[model samples]
Target: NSNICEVCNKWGRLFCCDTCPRSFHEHCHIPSVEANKNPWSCIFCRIKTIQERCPESQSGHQESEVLMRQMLPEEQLKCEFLLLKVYCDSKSCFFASEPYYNREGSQGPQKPMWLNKVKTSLNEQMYTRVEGFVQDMRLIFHNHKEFYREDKFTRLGIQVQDIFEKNFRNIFAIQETS
Candidate 1:
């Protein structure tokens, strides 16, 4: 009896409300619904539920920020390298301070094709020429020296020097010591 539609008094295509015992006919519900999403509620119940929901429990970003800050220096360097590498690899736009124009007078310079191929080869140092990674990084900067003065390029140089001295060299030293 409670499951029956309030409007039709019969159980033909009925939708139920979680808050109230009254069921509704498909054609009789005020806010019509063809299908129910997860945790479906009638219009009356949904309105009341939304109004009473707690605001404090809605966002989880602070937890993620705390976890990001907890990362170790080595881990942070790796993450920073990857971010810089990806941004440089994407070749979306040039890292220039002044405006430049293309053949059609379009402002700004496009990225170079060679930038994407610039990457670190970590494992190769074990069996092959140990300076391979450093050489690769050097070549990338040399080939694009015209844009070296750009803000992002300058940052890239600092990150490269930091990672090489702090992370890469430390690991090699540890391996040699052991």
Candidate 2:
């Protein structure tokens, strides 16, 4: 009448998530959870990571969306890594590198007011179209002037969107931790 993991008590290495109430044996879940030094992940957490950290989740990331995504396991991992990177960098530096940002550093006259609104709303997670990113894109276009056609601008917009998504996922993953 002793307590044991409901899933793998008898013939396997019994285990449970130390951070959660959900219980399972090592074999019943990801076998090497503890080996990775991170807390043991139960089925629920595994699902969260897989869906939340994927690239398609990044694809689904709209400004109005809930900031999570519906994606496959591999895609989630990539997006998670990207989000982690974006979240860790300094805001000024990160925004400075964005395509829409101005290197003039907040001195630009045409900087959109919506960006300020976004900054206030997003605060720590402001990785979208900041002044610096816009300026950066302008410089890129200048450098590639001969090839900078309308189609190229469209392609650049798409690339900026992808870059923002990748950085968003990275930042979200890191913020969730600290």
Candidate 3:
């Protein structure tokens, strides 16, 4: 018989969490934090019951959620999250941006056409030659002598996170720093 969630009793690759000590499958919980402590709660229990894992519970604690129709400030923070804003005027930019735009809503200024084309082409080129573009970009930025700060834009090499590429890639070269 395989191990199962103590709360739900669903069986799978079960193990007692190190911290929570509740029995659970290896894959059920995210990050799969090793169950070394073998405490009292399994990963799921610790996360759901013990830790109050659901954000809703925390928001509900606020007076406004219980009392008024206005959304509590905490709720806003909980809902608000940073997302990549790709702005481009070109067809390629719009095409490349189609997926992210589909998610949430369009949220940035317009970008130049040639720049967007260059970005798409460079992304294609990088994928053909490299294993992972983001990882490669991280390594390049971390190692580069003159340039630094790999934000959404302004990195030495290509930093492809999902479909969009930084518009300011070429603007910040290694040699041009005062």
Candidate 4:
């Protein structure tokens, strides 16, 4: 027989909180924030602790905001597109290890090549360099002999093309209005 969890009000394996008169399911108290011995707090009661766990500081946010403001609309969109590409590439690479997975290379947590390219272009802070960088990405995306296959290329291609069109449309509209 198991105790009923106070959160979901169901019978299950639960850990009783020392500080408060509450018993929570293991899933309900994820990460298991414990204070000293026999004392733990659920995520809801430890809001301050969760907030403090973030590595980024106010200065980093200020710096990023300044950098974002310095870019033109098209440049911002380009940056965002690169970020999305990195995100997609990371997911694909991370799941590559599963059997029957189409992506090449040893499966496991590995950084994709495109991530470095984007990082370098971002550090350069010039649109011309970014344009060349993205051109390289386009070539890599469409290369059938290596990396992305035709099916994957077609899916990612549509997304990249849409972003490029959006950037151009915004650039034209801004120029016309100004």
Which order, best to worst by TM-score?
Answer: 4, 1, 2, 3
TM-score of 4: 0.28
Model 1 lDDT per residue over 1-178, tens place: 2777754456777777666777777645533444757556665454334335744322332322322343343333332343233232223133212223342322332433232233222211121332433344444434344444454554654544444344333322222232
Model 1, which residues run further than 4 Å from truth? 1-127, 142-146, 150-153, 174-178
Model 2 C-alpha RMSD to native: 15.9
RMSD of each: 21.2, 15.9, 19.7, 13.8
Tell me the spans in candidate 4 whose CA falls farther than 4 Å from its real position.
1-116, 125-130, 144-153, 171-178
lDDT of each: 0.41, 0.39, 0.31, 0.42
Q: Estimate each model's TM-score.
A: 0.26, 0.24, 0.22, 0.28
Encode model 4's per-residue lDDT on 78-111: one tens digit a residue. 3544343333332333222222325555242232
Candidate 2: where are CA atoms >4 Å away? Answer: 1-13, 36-38, 52-178
Number of the top lDDT candidate: 4
Global Cα lDDT for candidate 1: 0.41
Error of 3 at 157 (Å): 39
In terms of lDDT, which candidate is stronger, 1 or 4? 4
Backbone clashes counted, model 3: 11
The Cα error of candidate 4 at residue 111, in Å, is: 16
Q: Pick the candidate with the highest TM-score.
A: 4
Residues 40-80 of candidate 3 have per-residue lDDT tens digits of: 44323433452255444433232222223232333221111
